[PDB]
From a paper:
The AcrA-[name]-TolC complex is a secondary active antiport system in [name], powered by the electrochemical proton gradient across the inner membrane of this Gram-negative bacterium. Its biological function is to capture cytotoxic compounds from either the periplasmic space or the inner membrane, and to expel them across the outer membrane, into the extracellular medium. [name] is the inner-membrane component of the system, and is responsible for both substrate recognition and energy transduction. The asymmetric trimer structures indicate that this domain also cycles between three distinct conformations, and point to several ionizable residues in its core (D407, D408, K940 and R971) that might function as a proton-relay network.
To further assess the proposed proton-relay mechanism and its influence on the conformation of the TM domain, we solved the atomic structures of four [name] variants, namely K940A, R971A, D407N and D408N, all of which abolish the drug-efflux activity of [name]. Electron-density maps for these variants could be resolved at resolutions ranging from 2.0 to 2.3 Å, which are sufficient to discern the precise configuration of side-chains and structural waters inside the TM domain. In all cases, the crystal structures represent an asymmetric configuration of the [name] trimer. None of the substitutions studied caused significant changes in the internal structure of the R1 and R2 repeats, compared to the wildtype L, T and O states. The relative orientation of these two repeats is also unchanged in the K940A and D408N mutants, as is the side-chain configuration of the proton-relay network, aside from the mutations. That is, these two substitutions appear to perturb the conformational cycle of the transporter by altering the energetic balance between the L, T and O states, rather than by precluding the protomers from adopting native-like conformations in each of these states. Indeed, electrostatic calculations analogous to those carried out for the wildtype protein show that in the K940A structure, D408 is constitutively neutralized throughout the cycle. D407, which is more proximal to R971, is deprotonated in the L and T states and protonated in the O state, as in the wildtype. Similarly for the D408N variant, D407 is predicted to become protonated only in the O state, while the substituted N408 is evidently neutral throughout the cycle (K940 and R971 are protonated in all states in both mutants). These results imply that the ionic interactions across the R1-R2 interface that stabilize the L and T states are weakened in the mutants. By contrast, the O state is probably less affected (K940A) or not at all (D408N), since the repeats become disengaged in this state.
Residue numbers in the entry:
A (entry chain D): 11 to 166
B (entry chain B): 1 to 1033
C (entry chain A): 98 to 241
D (entry chain A): 290 to 337
E (entry chain C): 50 to 97
F (entry chain C): 866 to 913
The structure:
């Protein structure tokens, strides 16, 4: 960890675009991670800060960085319904099929929260409709258990 | 009345003796404390939910309690925190004047009825309902110096062998243990458990069965068969008493017949109930007692009684155990009493000297020396009767009143002496004539002072409670003062003064007094010449007066306001705040630095550092701590450089370097409620369904906007905690059902191991104590540890936690706040320099009006007590103004002549402001009360000038100017005498350094500035006021 | 009679009976009040756009207005003319029998799966030496 | 339906109730409105 | 119920008594703990 | 009983002092008062 890295984790989390700008100009480590393995990109993904997501990617952020439980920024953005950030991440080479330690994918997460547009994007980018988590569940299993009919229909 | 007692000096003495006995008695029995109760009554509800996260606490405890806080009288507002240490505190604040006992029983009773809705483990811990207090009498530290005891060892020793005796000590109202009594600690090993197909559930079950009190009955109990010879109680199973016995608890018998005991799956030891606080006193393990003074108790007696009890425990201490006193307000309070007694005594001595300098005979000298103590004693008796205590405020109240008391004594005696020298009348006849001249004015003065100070007793809230202490003290003193002036001092004059030959002004005397008299007689003529010239040219003086009034307003508007002066109380505080998520060990490192600094760099100033790791003020947790610093006695800290303010400043600069931590030192506030600062206290509120995240966004929005007005708002900040990473674990219901693993087994296995669980009680050397099970540390540190915990399925197979769970990182709140039952976030800030808190509050409301739909706000605390009892000041001094005018009108039998007295007000205020401004002080409580007494005394001087003038015109047919010059000639000496004695007397206060000098300066500076300009200006301006007012009508 | 003391004396005796009462009675909350028997006023609430039913308004009132009114000094008792919302589970005996289940299973499942668990902390005190992580463990939370 | 606590002042309590309702109104859902169907308070104030 | 005198004293009487501090006007306190498990604690206050 | 006995001397002393002062005040004398107070043992001995 570094001084400016800490400041960047905080600014990305807070969505302070201008500070991120300045920090990017000064070489603040885009690959800094806190104790649970979240990078500034994780943070911006989680809290829905799109412009910072884009800035961070222009500045060499690891789009497929994973935390200590194997989750990527795409997991976060997909889970919390940030559609534009999901799109940007995918445009920049996010692994649409990344499995966290639980065998959970971005598609599983988006299904579970019923984010329909995000599910369509992930499918559009090759999300594996048949991927099973550690319990043998698919996005489709999740949709019928949740009783989400629109979602179930999308997943055939 | 004066006539009555001039003929009845013995009756007058009897009244005086009665007053003295009452006051003497009052002095013996009066309670003593640093401060009286000031803050509105509050009741706190505290609950503990072992291993609970903030949201769990809030949603299974806090909301439920809050929803039952109905039908309670005189509630102002209610607030709460729920946090991830598993703690909730709900605070209910009541209207000033509410009976705190009733408030508290109504709260406790509504709680009792909500208990059945709380979780079992919360009912088990209990929920405490208490009266709130932030002030301690003292903190007794208890340390072990030979490395043989842990803080847990010490806390239990204190709990078992010291606390109860201190609680039973005379005058103590409450004692808090800084730690806990022992708990029986069962630290489980998941590998051992799984080895024998056991879980924490089996451990809890076995403990509940083998550590229990079992009822049996009696042999030969009633109804018996007749002829029974024996009746005896049956004793069956009773609780375990020792770690050995807990160790031998039987968990399982294997097929080979071998036995699994609790000690085979766990480490067993006496330990603490909690491990969140690590306390050290100069690096050594520490516990302690926080002691509060009981209602009506005498602080000094109690502190003394506490020390005597401790001393008689000392012989039985184990080796290395030592008592330490890091905080004790008593020595400071002793100083204040000695200083106030010193001030009053030398005031009396100064009056003595001034009386002899001018009057030059010891008999006149003795009269004030008797009258003033009689007034003081009687005032104590009245205060006592009112239920007041001897405290900082009431003591300084009497100091602020000294000028007023002395003036009544000097005025009565000086006038008799003048009349004797000017007329040759014998002492008795002179005294009658003299009281005939000042009688009505003395009463008028008492009424006017009453009209000035009494309205000040009617301010609301906390600042009102403070003002009331000065108001009632000073008004009582004035009441006694005029009674003694109409009763005792005339009697004393008529019977103790020697005659003076007509025309004898002592100018024939030899030596110094001979030279003083001719000097002062000439000065009087010079003085009256000037007044004569001034009165030939009053136009320019009206201009000068307006210039003073304008300047008074100018200085008044720029003088920053405050509440009470900081003091060097021999102690101060250091805040240690690490980033969110920082562990206890990291926080300890920084406290170690802080401590090493003070014991090195401040070696000559610091006695001790009491380091409390894990404790904060606005949120506990592993990442926060405090270092409480105790200094050597003021006597070993000569100079401003070795006083608290300087030590603190150096500390904070030194710690500004410290790496990843905010570390700063600060002095303690005089009270602590009252919030000092400029300070406003704002609550942002979720009024709709919004939720924590949307409330946070709205808060951030507000804070960003506030920051754009540095001109108006400064340091606008949240008072709470930011969200932090938390570990979310999902139990898969289906997989658990498929494996035959019950959810209950899963959840208690998790909670017991990782959170700890209060099982039941045991008896440790005759004292009942708790039994806790929890994982040994190394098995509950990290996510990978989760999978080492196994649960037994119905079919007997051991199933690892990883088989039926999944986990992810997320963010959540470590501390959830609510206000009046709704989600909330407290924001602190202050008005920017030059700006009024009222202005700052208005902006905050404006910014608050533009926040997202559903977001509301409120004012609480010090700000709640501005939105009301501040819109109240102007109408009180309007009432004061009107009543003062009405008294003067009655005194002078004129609607217009009163103005010539009231015009004096700015003359003293200008000097007070000039002096406070110059010395860099503030417009605080002592300043303000001082303004009132300075105004009061100058008004009394003016009243007697106008009175003399007006009577010369009415009774001797003299002209306006002729009467004014004669009036002002007669009043010059008594006016100078009082001012001289007073100004000299309040001078030590102005220059004072060291303990209590903050208060002493605030009292002295304003009074001395004001009395100088009031005296010097009014002896020239009052003649002008009277002449111009009389001409105009 | 001092109504404060009367209420205190009544409740002191009530808490002696409380433990002898059925658990379902204690959980509904028994209350002790000191008020007049007649209504001071009735505060009515309506929706002039007709966008809320009787049930909706009643829940709105119970959930956003009634508690603060109930805490207001001088308010002795407050009656809601309606009912706060609850999670209503309307059981079907035919389907219960079809799956060989009863209301007892339904009740047990609800207690098991609508639970708010205390689960402790990673890196919680007392910790091992050199611990770097401290975080709350969040398990089951109440359904919503 | 609000009942007055034993001994409490009816007019003061009604005032405090209105003050409290005033704090709530700005956050009502659209269409929600308070009406005043039954009040024993006005008559006291008016008859006096 | 069922507790002996010493057990009820250690688990009940002493627990209550050590919380009976800082009560106004308390003159003295007496208690007894007995073999039927019953505890009685009497607190006597100054005459006024 | 202990309290009763302990405060009695104080009671007598303050009572005698008050009686003396009232006399002094009423008869504008210290001598008249001292003259009558000397009577007190004359009555007390009979009571005893
Ligand atoms: C105890 C405090 C003692 C402090 C003493 C320090 C000195 C204070 C001086 C007070 C001011 C008195 O100043 C007084 O002014 C008036 C004018 O206004 C002068 O009066 C003179 O000038 C005026 C105006 O030209 C003429 O009308 C007047 O006939 C003439 O005698 C007085 O001669 C002077 O004595
Ligand atoms: C905050 N304070 C003055 C101190 C100072 C030094 C200390 O050494 C301690 C405290 C707080 C007290 C509170 C007590 C409390 N109780 C009176 C037993 C308590 O409920 C808790 C708790 N975490 O639940 C403690 O931390 C606690 O056990 C504790 O360990 C403390 C402690 O060790």
């Amino acid at each position: 960890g570094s001084d400016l890295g800490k400041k960047l984790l905080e600014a990305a989390r807070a969505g302070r675009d201008d500070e991120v700008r300045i920090l990017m100009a000064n070489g603040a480590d885009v690959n800094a991670a806190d104790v649970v393995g979240w990078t500034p990109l994780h943070l911006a993904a989680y809290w829905g800060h799109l412009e910072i997501v884009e800035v961070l990617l222009k500045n060499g952020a690891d789009v497929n960085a994973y935390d200590t439980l194997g989750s990527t920024p795409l997991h976060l953005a997909a889970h919390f319904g940030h559609l534009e950030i999901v799109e940007v991440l995918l445009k920049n080479g996010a692994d649409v099929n990344a499995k966290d330690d639980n065998g959970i994918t971005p598609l599983h997460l988006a299904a579970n929260r019923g984010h329909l547009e995000i599910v369509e994007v992930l499918l559009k980018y090759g999300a594996d409709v048949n991927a099973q988590d550690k319990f043998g569940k698919t996005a489709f299993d999740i949709s019928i258990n949740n009783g989400n009919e629109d979602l179930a229909e999308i997943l055939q | 009345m004066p006539n009555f007692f001039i003929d009845r000096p013995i009756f007058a003495w009897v009244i005086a003796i009665i007053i003295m006995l009452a006051g003497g008695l009052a002095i013996l029995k009066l309670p003593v404390a640093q401060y009286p109760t000031i803050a509105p009554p509050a009741v706190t509800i505290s609950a503990s939910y072992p291993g609970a996260d903030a949201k769990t606490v809030q949603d299974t405890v806090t909301q439920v309690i809050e929803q039952n806080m109905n039908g309670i009288d005189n509630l102002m507002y209610m607030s709460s925190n729920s946090d991830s240490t598993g703690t909730v505190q709900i605070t209910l604040t009541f209207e000033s004047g509410t009976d705190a006992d009733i408030a508290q029983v109504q709260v406790q009773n509504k709680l009792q009825l909500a208990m059945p809705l709380l979780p079992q483990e919360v009912q088990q811990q209990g929920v405490s309902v208490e009266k709130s207090s932030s002030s301690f009498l003292m903190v007794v530290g208890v340390i072990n110096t030979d490395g043989t005891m842990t803080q847990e060892d010490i806390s239990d020793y204190v709990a078992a062998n010291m606390k109860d005796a201190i609680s039973r000590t005379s005058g103590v109202g409450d004692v808090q243990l800084f730690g806990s009594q022992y708990a029986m600690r069962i630290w489980m090993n998941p590998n051992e458990l799984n080895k024998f197909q056991l879980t924490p559930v089996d451990v809890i079950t076995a403990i509940k069965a083998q550590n229990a009190q079992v009822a049996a009955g009696q042999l030969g109990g009633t109804p018996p068969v007749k002829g029974q010879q024996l009746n005896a109680s049956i004793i069956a199973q009773t609780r375990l008493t020792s770690t050995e016995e807990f160790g031998k608890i039987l968990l399982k018998v294997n097929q080979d017949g071998s036995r699994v005991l609790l000690r085979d799956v766990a480490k067993i030891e006496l330990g603490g109930e909690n491990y969140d606080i690590i306390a050290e006193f100069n690096g050594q393990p520490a516990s302690g007692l926080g002691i509060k003074l009981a209602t009506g108790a005498n602080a000094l007696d109690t502190a003394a009684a506490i020390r005597a009890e401790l001393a008689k425990m000392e012989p039985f201490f184990p080796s290395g155990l030592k008592i330490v006193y890091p905080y004790d307000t008593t020595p400071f309070v002793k100083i204040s009493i000695h200083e106030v007694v010193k001030t009053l005594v030398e005031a009396i001595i100064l009056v003595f000297l001034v009386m002899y300098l001018f009057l030059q005979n010891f008999r006149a000298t003795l009269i004030p020396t008797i009258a003033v103590p009689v007034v003081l004693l009687g005032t104590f008796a009245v205060l006592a009767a009112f239920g007041f205590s001897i405290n900082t405020l009431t003591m300084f109240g009497m100091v602020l009143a000294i000028g007023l008391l002395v003036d009544d004594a000097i005025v009565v005696v000086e006038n008799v002496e003048r009349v004797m020298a000017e007329e040759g009348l014998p002492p008795k006849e002179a005294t009658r004539k003299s009281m005939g001249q000042i009688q009505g004015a003395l009463v008028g003065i008492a009424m006017v002072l009453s009209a000035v100070f009494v309205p000040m007793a009617f301010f609301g809230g906390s600042t009102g409670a403070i003002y009331r202490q000065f108001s009632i003290t000073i008004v009582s003193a004035m009441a006694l003062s005029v009674l003694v002036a109409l009763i005792l001092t005339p009697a004393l004059c008529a019977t103790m003064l020697k005659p003076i030959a007509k025309g004898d002004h002592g100018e024939g005397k030899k030596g110094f007094f001979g030279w003083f008299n001719r000097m002062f007689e000439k000065s009087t003529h010079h003085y009256t010449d000037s007044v004569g010239g001034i009165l030939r040219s009053t136009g320019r003086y009206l201009v000068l007066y307006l210039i003073i009034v304008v300047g008074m307003a100018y200085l008044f508007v720029r003088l920053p306001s405050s509440f009470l002066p900081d003091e060097d109380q021999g102690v101060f505080m250091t805040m240690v705040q690490l980033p969110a998520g920082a562990t206890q060990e990291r926080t300890q490192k920084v406290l170690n630095e802080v401590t090493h600094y003070y014991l090195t760099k401040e070696k000559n100033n610091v006695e001790s550092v009491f380091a409390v790791n894990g404790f904060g003020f606005a949120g506990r947790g592993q990442n926060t701590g405090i270092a409480f610093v105790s200094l050597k006695d003021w006597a070993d800290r000569p100079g401003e450089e070795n006083k608290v303010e300087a030590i603190t400043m150096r500390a904070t600069r030194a710690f500004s370097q410290i790496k990843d931590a905010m570390v700063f030192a600060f002095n303690l506030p005089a009270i602590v409620e009252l919030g000092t600062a400029t300070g406003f206290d704002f609550e942002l509120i979720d009024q709709a369904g919004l939720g924590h995240e949307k409330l946070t966004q709205a808060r951030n929005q507000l804070l960003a906007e506030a920051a754009k007005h540095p001109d108006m708002l400064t340091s606008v900040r949240p008072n709470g905690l930011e969200d932090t990473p938390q570990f979310k674990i999902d139990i898969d219901q289906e997989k658990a059902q498929a494996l035959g693993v019950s959810i209950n087994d899963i959840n208690t296995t998790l909670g017991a191991a990782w959170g700890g669980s209060y099982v039941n009680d045991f008896i440790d050397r005759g004292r009942v104590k708790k039994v806790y099970v929890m994982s040994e540390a190394k098995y509950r540190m990290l996510p990978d540890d989760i999978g080492d915990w196994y649960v037994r399925a119905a079919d007997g197979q051991m199933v690892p936690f990883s088989a039926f769970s999944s986990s992810r990182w997320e963010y959540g709140s470590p501390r959830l706040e609510r206000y009046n039952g709704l989600p909330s976030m407290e924001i602190l800030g202050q008005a920017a320099p030059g700006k009024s808190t009222g202005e700052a509050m208005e902006l905050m409301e404006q910014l608050a009006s533009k926040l997202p739909t559903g977001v509301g706000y409120d004012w609480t605390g010090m700000s709640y007590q501005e939105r009301l009892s501040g819109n109240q000041a102007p109408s009180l001094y309007a009432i004061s103004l009107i009543v003062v005018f009405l008294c003067l009108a009655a005194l002078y039998e004129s609607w217009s002549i009163p103005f010539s007295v009231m015009l004096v007000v700015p003359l003293g205020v200008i000097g007070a402001l000039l002096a406070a401004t110059f010395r860099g002080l503030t417009n605080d409580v002592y300043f303000q009360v001082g303004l009132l007494t300075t105004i009061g005394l100058s008004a009394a001087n003016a009243i007697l000038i106008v009175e003399f003038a007006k009577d010369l015109m009415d009774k001797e047919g003299k002209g306006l100017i002729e009467a004014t010059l004669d009036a002002v000639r007669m009043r010059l000496r008594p006016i100078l005498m009082t001012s001289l004695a007073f100004i000299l007397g309040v001078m030590p206060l102005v220059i004072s350094t060291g303990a209590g000098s903050g208060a002493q300066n605030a009292v002295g500076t304003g009074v001395m500035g004001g009395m100088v300009t009031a005296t010097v200006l009014a002896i020239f301006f009052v003649p002008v006021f009277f002449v111009v007012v009389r001409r105009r009508f």
